Symmetry: D2
């Protein structure tokens, strides 16, 4: 009931649009986090550690869209800075668990003190759509596919990010 | 008139959603193109060469969301396969121009003969939204930001991709 | 799992938005059809008769969002003009069926010769959203609810309207 | 730059969709308000009176999508019930102003005690889209046209309706 043509059209559409979105976010994300000598995957774990305090590196991998192997290496380089701590559970656990540090939290805070959304590209690009809608675009069409792929357990990172950001101290002036 | 809080919420929203979209497309794109020993940026140039027959590597970079330096190296490794050809313009041109080859076109065709949209993730993930809308999601909210960033000249790749795909031979059976 | 508050908010939202949409379409629809001394429900039947050539007044009621009683009276006043014809089926049929006339078709055509979308309000109001999307808004969110209510058989009027309009003679110049 | 064909397609699309939306809301709105012997335009004024305490009948007409003449007659039949009160301003005012009564407020409250969103059609029809989006559809595409027509001053009724509904007593149990 579905044409291969309309499929290829869809795929070429979203593949070009997704690469434009990640590559532009990469540039603004890296410039924001490079003054602390970190990469986007390491920072992802540092924010995942704030939003979920104690999580297996396997969960860090799922929420981080990383390989388990990849998340291990960056988490270990993060402990070796003191920005993160490691824990092992009782009984019999193969899993290795992860928490943040006061040095790690403070690094996130001084990054928050330097958050200029003006410099970020997608922010300015979404200012037109915000003025017509009254609020930032909620891109529900995209959000539906991602849940329908990664799972509802993956999507819960948005909820906990929002609620923790809602109860947040000293973002900037005021 | 805009809260820094609603900005951070937006940024964390789209940054998590964009990374999920590119990483899942990467895996399905690479598996599709790896039987020919190519990467996603090289294939991008091979499709850009079909949709725009003669283009500067600088335009290949803009449409490809690549650095000019990066597009040069992959285009040169593509000529050294015979999948692509190079040209230089008259008068005085610093620019180096690019065309496809019959070997390069045929490689795209045998990849088209192996296009199973079932294996691609975002395809199956968009089947729910297609049934409710009658047709594949057009994600216009995203498409507006990207144009408002990369430029209308960048966006013309979708038009020429659609029209060339509409006039396409032997995708699969029928 | 659902708040009565978010329900009331939704209802007050769509009830105010729907009344604004119908009342503004009423004014532009009536001004367009009043030079022929017809109402919006009568014209609806005249277009339903073009898109579905022979239909029961009960189907005219479903597609017309009219009562069966209401559709009868207007269809009868339409036959008594010669803009429409009536038929009765074989065997044993309670139903009364309906077709268009050459006088009725020509009335639709001279209305088509007078279609100025500039005067229609929603047209100009949708010009902003069309420029950002490249094409007229497809309001899929609304279209999903209506199908989920009236039925898929009701929705088929859009398909046959589009395809018949695609194969249409002398709309205006060219 | 715009086809008359794509215009007619758009108009037939939204005209059929808007009539389906108003007619279905009419039936559920009237059944909800008929036990108090009121019509949808009268109830509209009674809610406009709650959301804007003292407003000219001309503003009631704009927010109510009514004629000034029509809003006068229903407001006068509302005062003659004691559900509403009238006032005249100082200096020199042609305008006649309007406020609610305790009898009028209590009528709205006992209607709120009888609000079953299950019986309302569009509510159940929007339950599918809510489950995929996590929240009720916000139909921003429609909301943009209406603002681009009726004006931003008209749209402020949604803001004051939301904020007043957010600070509301005894909707139902809890």
């Amino acid at each position: 009931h579905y044409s291969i043509k309309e499929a290829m059209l869809f795929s070429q559409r979203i593949a070009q649009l997704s690469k434009a979105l990640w590559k532009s976010i990469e540039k603004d994300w890296q410039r924001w986090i490079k003054p602390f000598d970190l990469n986007i995957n390491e920072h992802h774990i540092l924010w995942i550690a704030y939003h979920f305090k104690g999580a297996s590196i396997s969960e860090i991998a799922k929420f981080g869209v990383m390989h388990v192997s990849t998340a291990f290496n960056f988490s270990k380089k993060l402990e070796e800075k003191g920005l993160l701590s490691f824990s092992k559970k009782q009984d019999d656990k193969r899993n290795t668990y992860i928490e943040l540090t006061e040095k790690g939290e403070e690094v996130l805070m001084k990054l928050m003190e330097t958050y200029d959304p003006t410099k970020n590209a997608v922010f300015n690009g979404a200012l037109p759509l915000r003025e017509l809608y009254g609020k930032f675009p909620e891109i529900l069409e995209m959000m539906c596919i991602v849940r329908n792929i990664y799972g509802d357990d993956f999507m819960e990172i948005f909820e906990r990010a929002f609620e923790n950001i809602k109860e947040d101290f000293i973002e900037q002036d005021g």
